[PDB]
Subunit: 384 residues, 4 copies
Amino acid sequence: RPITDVVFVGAARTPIGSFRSAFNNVPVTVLGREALKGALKNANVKPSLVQEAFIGVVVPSNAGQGPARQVVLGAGCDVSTVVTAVNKMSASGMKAIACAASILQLDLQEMVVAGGMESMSCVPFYLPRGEIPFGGTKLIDGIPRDGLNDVYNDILMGACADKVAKQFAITREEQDKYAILSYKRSAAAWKEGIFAKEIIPLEVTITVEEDEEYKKVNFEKIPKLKPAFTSEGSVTAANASTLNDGAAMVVMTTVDGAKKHGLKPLARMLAYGDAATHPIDFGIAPASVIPKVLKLAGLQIKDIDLWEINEAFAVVPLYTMKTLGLDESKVNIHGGAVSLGHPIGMSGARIVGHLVHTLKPGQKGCAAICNGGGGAGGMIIEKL
Amino acid sequence: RPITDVVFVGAARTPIGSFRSAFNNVPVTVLGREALKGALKNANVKPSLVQEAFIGVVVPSNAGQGPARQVVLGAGCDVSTVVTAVNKMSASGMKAIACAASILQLDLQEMVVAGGMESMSCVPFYLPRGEIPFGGTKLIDGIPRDGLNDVYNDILMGACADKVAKQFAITREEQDKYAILSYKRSAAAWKEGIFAKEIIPLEVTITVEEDEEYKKVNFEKIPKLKPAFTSEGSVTAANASTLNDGAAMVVMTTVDGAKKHGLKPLARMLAYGDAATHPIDFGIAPASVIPKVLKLAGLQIKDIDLWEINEAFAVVPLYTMKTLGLDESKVNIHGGAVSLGHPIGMSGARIVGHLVHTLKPGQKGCAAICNGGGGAGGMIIEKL
Amino acid sequence: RPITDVVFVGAARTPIGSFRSAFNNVPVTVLGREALKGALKNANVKPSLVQEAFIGVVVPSNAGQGPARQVVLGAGCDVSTVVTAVNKMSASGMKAIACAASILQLDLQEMVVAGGMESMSCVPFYLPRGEIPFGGTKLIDGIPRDGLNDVYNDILMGACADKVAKQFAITREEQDKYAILSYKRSAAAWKEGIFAKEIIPLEVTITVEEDEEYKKVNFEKIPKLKPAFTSEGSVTAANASTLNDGAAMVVMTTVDGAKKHGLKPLARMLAYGDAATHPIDFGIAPASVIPKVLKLAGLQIKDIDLWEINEAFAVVPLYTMKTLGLDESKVNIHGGAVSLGHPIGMSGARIVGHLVHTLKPGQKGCAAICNGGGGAGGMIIEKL
Amino acid sequence: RPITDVVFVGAARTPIGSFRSAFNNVPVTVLGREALKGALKNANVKPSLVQEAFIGVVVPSNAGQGPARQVVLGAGCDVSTVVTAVNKMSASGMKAIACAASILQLDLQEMVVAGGMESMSCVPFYLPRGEIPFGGTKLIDGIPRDGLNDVYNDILMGACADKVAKQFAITREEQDKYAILSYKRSAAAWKEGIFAKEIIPLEVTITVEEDEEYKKVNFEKIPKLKPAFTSEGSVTAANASTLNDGAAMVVMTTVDGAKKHGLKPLARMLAYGDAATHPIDFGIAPASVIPKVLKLAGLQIKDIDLWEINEAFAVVPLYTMKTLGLDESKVNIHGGAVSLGHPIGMSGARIVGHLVHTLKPGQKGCAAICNGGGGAGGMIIEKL
Ligand SMILES: CCC(=O)SCCNC(=O)CCNC(=O)[C@H](O)C(C)(C)COP(=O)(O)OP(=O)(O)OC[C@H]1O[C@@H](n2cnc3c(N)ncnc32)[C@H](O)[C@@H]1OP(=O)(O)O
Ligand SMILES: CCC(=O)SCCNC(=O)CCNC(=O)[C@H](O)C(C)(C)COP(=O)(O)OP(=O)(O)OC[C@H]1O[C@@H](n2cnc3c(N)ncnc32)[C@H](O)[C@@H]1OP(=O)(O)O
Ligand SMILES: CCC(=O)SCCNC(=O)CCNC(=O)[C@H](O)C(C)(C)COP(=O)(O)OP(=O)(O)OC[C@H]1O[C@@H](n2cnc3c(N)ncnc32)[C@H](O)[C@@H]1OP(=O)(O)O
Ligand SMILES: CCC(=O)SCCNC(=O)CCNC(=O)[C@H](O)C(C)(C)COP(=O)(O)OP(=O)(O)OC[C@H]1O[C@@H](n2cnc3c(N)ncnc32)[C@H](O)[C@@H]1OP(=O)(O)O
């Protein structure tokens, strides 16, 4: 099969909750379950048709055995469904979609689901096994420990971004200008109904139906903030992604599978892949994966109508756009992780699902998402 | 490409350590690093040639950001290497190999490594985020919580095995006879040098060069033990797999990649896949995945020379053999997880690597490994 | 020396804070320090004159080394001051005063301070030393563990009170009537300025100057509440004492010491002592200690103008009054622990200090306070 | 009464166990129970005659409600018995005896028990109440937190001793010579049967009948050790007291009570008291309390036949002896806390009970014990 036989037939996501707020105490598996129910409904695919699932999640500690399996069975899929979880840090939700696409192209399955999820609010603290040391010991926070602290450099992802920003003269002022644009774009998109196709609401009693993060902004305060990660840094709490909860899922099949069940293909796969570099330099990895997947698709930069370059920090889209010569009016046009937030296992799936829904038929979209350890995932789709 | 273009060029593993013993306080990332270095040496592949890695690991809590990445960089691979972790419970090490095979068949990479790892000794305890409730709360053990307790039935994997055993009249005595055979087969294999090709030793100061579990047996005591999981049960500490630490890796390429680099293919891929059923019934899933992968390879039961059916409990090989009509003299002939131990992320890779080394040229081997949540992975290879 | 040579020259207390409210995160040592500064100021005694201190505190875990010493040095006393802490559960603050009185009567010191303190809000959770058990373990709440759970019966103090209430036909209705009277008396006393002599305020920024608990009442809801401790119980959250934070201190000397420093004796000691019975029956112990200290003072029930019978539960003053034939109009006339709250190490000192301030000159007051394990302290003073 | 009317009629103690060794996991209340039963048996006093108890214990966290009460009821005393715990750090066991003596002299009771206890092995770790902070927090060790760290200087008691040693030229070599003498004196006393009168054994299954610490010595290694507390320090693990478990109790009455019950007085009280100085200087406090209690008894240094100056560190007896001009052949003649160990709540009672048994009729003994926060207790008795 050619890669273009792989089609997306549905996509949905939860709202993104703010840290310890809307989805406080809501396990990641609940979020994933509701996103998957939503995606299957969007696809008009009954859960019993799903043969296999790949779900990204980075720090599922204390969510119980096989949280990806919990999601799939919770969404009503049959126990015959095959399920795997993947962790590629913030690329997890995209890599899950890639793995699903690979088994479809090899005709190993016909109907598959994929996506990503994270509850950063529910990440626990750790105590090591064995003898508690005389004199006491640290209760370890799983978020920096397994999520956000670089092992090799022993500094947070944001401090890595400070390094890249200084090296490439990406100023505090440019980062704040970009952050403001992201917040304003997120608000405009919500007002225009842009997310209506892709959002499913949750009851928690309250009903959560809107992204929580993007109203949490004070434009006048942004240039006044102190550096958040290093003493002479440029990255701040306003121009960095936030800690968040959410899930995003897609339903994928082959052209034959769609015909067989009378489904409407929403988009098709053109290319996917990954690139990596030094851990501290994850911020430049999207600029390497993008040419790689363009080449796989037989396309050039001018052929992409919309870019989703995950806003890990304002630093990353800024580096990527300037280094590759991208038009900012075609990049992250409905906001991104700086203003919508960043449940790390979710975001890679969210930005792909967003392109599936928001591209006009015929248009091509490219998503690129950097990840801890120095990587980035890339993916190109064509709207149908 | 055809699946038969996918070839294994190397395989290696650490010894398996017993719980809180040989590899006590040794992070999973150290174990995986040494297994990966060993596999690359076995393949005569310089680490700089590795383009992508998939590594299985089930409960990596508190091992730091991106433990699979830590392994790959620790082993000397270039920062350009693409890395993903996978969790399919005890099938993780096998599913990783499958994912690697898929991208090789699609010509998305040429040189890939895959495997699995677990340090059960280093799994931590959890405390949830937020208010410790008045009256106190439970400090949670990550091993049952994220590893071994079934979410849906709220019983341990061994209690699930008790259920399957009683349903299908797999007696305590049959389970004990199988357990004794496994311990004896493990000791005989060690004495005969069977594992010399696949083992790499580790310095921990001690040198660990031998599987620690298989000498921890008293044959006369085995029929005297009480049930380990349920009051009227048949599963015991002796006829159940143990808790362990270890890692296993393989190096994979295409027939063209092997030619290009002057490498000797050891084995080729014939088929891989997965099946699943009700979570409590994971023990019967290997009996479903085996016919599935036989059909994918165009083979019958008689065409397989060696079976590796992971010994999660003696129950599982016994059910599988009697349901499919397998010859026990061709099943788990050098022992298995009851006597060698079961680092859950490792075992699916171990049993495939074992077939790569121990099959005679021209022979075909089938590996099947059940997993929490109701699944099993399957794989068939042919020795060259 | 006769006991009547022992005189009180000052007394002060903090407001009582509600659980995890006004004094949340304020260590017990801060509360004790401010109460002791206040008492010394009330006495017109410079801190350098204090020779010895006894301070009651029941659960000082994690308050650091020698919290009683911390209080004394924090209040400005010289390092030459001798300091001891005592724990007699809820009798601690009274027993501390008794011990101080004993060394004054023996002329072993001339100027001493005594009192009680507790921060129930700051009591920690416990994890035992050594190997954390496989499968997890309980994080133990210090409040029930070291404060409120009876060791012998393995039930809470309130469940003990249910037992005594049922045995002596002290009804739910009588307990609620008493609880209402306590809340109304507390409010009336605050409005009338009754506590103005004895209270010192604290800055925490906010200024805490009033008892927090006594406004936390809904009179209409009281008869509607469910039992709080046992399924068919009579004790409820409204008619039981609450969990609270506070400290109370007194300054004591001999008649000669007062003359020497030109101090005004506020009251003199007539008798003190203790009685005890079966742990579950602590509620009847005040009725035994009262005749004991009356006999020591050469007095009868009619000779006491005011009674302070600590309101551990409404059960306890009710039992005591009816069994001894006391006039309720002379008992706990300005409220008590049901409505003002009950920092367990404090209350014994509070009720004595209250009598020191609120008796008219010439009048005699008797304080009696039951305690976990089956005890009660008693004390009689004469206002001067 | 005169102080000389107060008589000791019995004394006993557990062996002292080494940290996490003989009495590992044995609650302090068990140790105190057995010591109290033993003392009552030594006195030939039936437990039902005991009217009141004072028991010292410094860090009873997680030992349950009212551990002193648990000891008294566990020993078979009547529920009518009045019970109080006291904490004066390492003076607790002595101050308890003082408090008992005071109420006997005032004729408030006739038959009283007193002593001290500690299980340092069972001291727990602490987690504060409320939100675990983002980023994690310290699991606190109760031993330094509530036992051994000075609050004001934020250094351990051993670091305070380093300060006193350097200020007064008490050399490493002098401290080591004293430590060696203590270990040798302890071994000689054990061999000579010195402790046979005062020890009661315990079943834990093992029988513990001997002090565990004094054989844990290597004389040749002592001068080779590194400082234990400060980089340029003189205090080492060998010349400092150790962490230990144990309990010691006495039975006390008046000359009239002894006559009434046909008991033999063993010793009489001559004086008791306390002194204090700056917290870091607790090591010089015994040199202040000794002249104080000598004056109270109308005695001089030459009138004392045996000194028990608690060996918190070798520093403390050395300072005391040279400052007061004491004859070392009369000081700690059967070893002390450096070689026998130092359960902090126990030791003040142990050294007084030891004098009760080991003094010859007509001899006078003085005990002095320093304590955290800057204090020392002192006591003088006369053997009958
Ligand atoms: C490797 C590939 C990747 O994807 S890396 C990305 C992974 N994710 C991350 O690294 C998450 C990084 N983010 C964080 O760690 C947190 O959000 C950080 C930066 C630490 C901020 O947390 P925290 O300090 O708790 O936030 P805060 O809300 O209290 O803000 C601090 C001060 O800044 C202000 N602030 C914040 N946002 C805005 C805004 N949009 N507009 C105006 N002001 C803002 C807050 O008001 C606050 O101010 P103040 O100090 O209280 O006065
Ligand atoms: C879903 C797909 C899957 O892969 S499921 C499988 C995943 N893994 C698991 O589920 C791990 C299951 N195993 C376990 O949980 C533990 O190994 C269990 C069964 C609990 C045993 O742990 P534990 O009780 O600590 O072991 P233990 O060594 O103290 O043994 C208990 C008593 O039995 C004995 N015993 C043990 N093994 C043998 C043997 N081979 N021969 C003779 N005797 C044996 C021990 O001597 C011990 O005896 P005793 O009670 O001390 O007298
Ligand atoms: C041995 C000698 C001694 O001194 S023994 C005494 C030592 N101290 C103790 O034993 C403390 C005993 N008290 C306690 O343990 C707690 O205060 C108990 C009883 C458990 C209550 O705690 P908690 O359940 O958290 O309180 P809550 O405020 O949520 O109340 C529960 C429901 O009752 C109500 N309530 C309470 N007080 C009143 C009142 N004064 N008037 C009207 N209603 C009241 C609350 O509104 C609450 O109602 P709801 O269930 O939320 O609808
Ligand atoms: C304020 C009034 C007071 O009463 S203050 C006193 C209160 N109590 C205290 O302060 C307790 C002070 N003691 C302690 O904290 C511990 O005992 C300290 C000093 C920290 C020692 O603990 P730890 O380091 O675990 O001991 P350790 O047995 O491992 O010994 C360390 C090395 O020294 C050696 N050592 C020890 N004792 C002896 C001896 N008697 N003869 C010869 N050698 C000795 C050990 O062999 C050990 O050597 P190595 O480093 O393993 O080679």
